[PDB]
Design a protein around this ligand. Structure first.
Ligand SMILES: C[C@]12CC[C@H](O)C[C@@H]1CC[C@@H]1[C@@H]2CC[C@]2(C)[C@H](O)CC[C@@H]12
Ligand SMILES: C[C@]12CC[C@H](O)C[C@@H]1CC[C@@H]1[C@@H]2CC[C@]2(C)[C@H](O)CC[C@@H]12
Ligand SMILES: [Ca+2]
Ligand SMILES: [Ca+2]
Ligand SMILES: [Zn+2]
Ligand SMILES: [Zn+2]
Lengths: 176, 176
């Protein structure tokens, strides 16, 4: 399976940004495998508005951390086992009703309830950035250093049929 | 080890309530072992004010759930493995800086960050209720049925030297 580097050297910007049409979304889940020895960094960021409608999934002290900021909730939460053990880990992030669910290696490790209304409704465009944020780290509810020295593979983001475009500030590097 | 029943039949009220002097608190952690086959219910509730300063640790679909409502945060979060497997489980809830940490069987499974300022400061009295709430379940951010058919043992609550009093609406029942 082709795996890409989650950061390009300095690691101050995402390695890729995908834009989606929310009205066209039929699938809200995202999944991928990640491998790393890095205990802190951004795995992926998502927003409909960088100002007041955003989400971040990363690692802090080796464990998953989600920061979320929207009309219904504002939170900084850590959960799950350490993932900075150099092994491949399966990760899934999905919407289940008004909740955001995080599954690690097939097991649910965190369910953030009552945090969102329907995506398609309410913010017609959603952006997903890998390995970086779309705003300064200092703007996070709880700052961390975004650079994540790890590998990503077998990734699936939301609904491909709803993807408007994809960019890369530079060029994706292989973990081979 | 003497174990007590976490609910008395109907299970509409706590089996015990302990009151503490916050200014006297030197230890903020609580720990205990719980065993149960019940997938939903309140393990313990805590507040400094039932109106706007409260906390609840329970089970929903077999897994730990924390609801918290205070000046800094308002949340409903599920985490950790199922605990309704009839085995004894060690549980710890503690303050670590501005965070509330939940450990299950020796492993950190959830860290709610940026949710509280110093306890001793800011609410001079804290109440801890076991197996029930100190307000209607309908008043929870996300209602659940409080009755938890399980056993509790080896419990330690905050700082005993700060305990003002303890009550029991009825009488503690043994799991023997
Ligand atoms: C987590 C998820 C959904 C599952 C999907 O796999 C990834 C996206 C990323 C953006 C989140 C959204 C959930 C709703 C959020 C928190 C708000 O609307 C602001 C940003 C949004
Ligand atoms: C969780 C803990 C601390 C660890 C201890 O072991 C149990 C107590 C229960 C009451 C919580 C408090 C944390 C601060 C809370 C959320 C707010 O002040 C309102 C109720 C309070
Ligand atoms: Ca890093
Ligand atoms: Ca029950
Ligand atoms: Zn919005
Ligand atoms: Zn208060």
């Amino acid at each position: 399976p082709p795996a890409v580097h989650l950061s390009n050297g300095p690691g101050q910007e995402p390695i890729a940004v995908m834009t989606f049409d929310l009205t066209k979304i039929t699938k809200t889940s995202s999944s991928f495998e990640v491998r790393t020895w890095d205990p802190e960094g951004v795995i992926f960021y998502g927003d409909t508005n960088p100002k007041d409608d955003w989400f971040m999934l990363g690692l802090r002290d080796g464990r998953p951390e989600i920061q979320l900021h929207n009309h219904w909730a504002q939170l900084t939460v850590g959960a799950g086992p350490r993932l900075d053990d150099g092994r491949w880990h399966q990760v899934e992030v999905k919407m289940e009703g008004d909740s955001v669910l995080l599954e690690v290696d097939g097991e649910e490790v965190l369910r953030l309830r009552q945090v969102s209304g329907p995506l398609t409704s309410k913010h017609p465009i959603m952006r997903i950035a890998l390995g970086g944020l779309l705003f300064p780290a200092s703007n996070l509810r709880l700052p961390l250093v975004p650079a994540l020295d790890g590998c990503l593979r077998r990734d699936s983001w939301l609904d491909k049929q709803a993807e408007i475009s994809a960019s890369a500030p530079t060029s994706l590097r292989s973990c081979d």
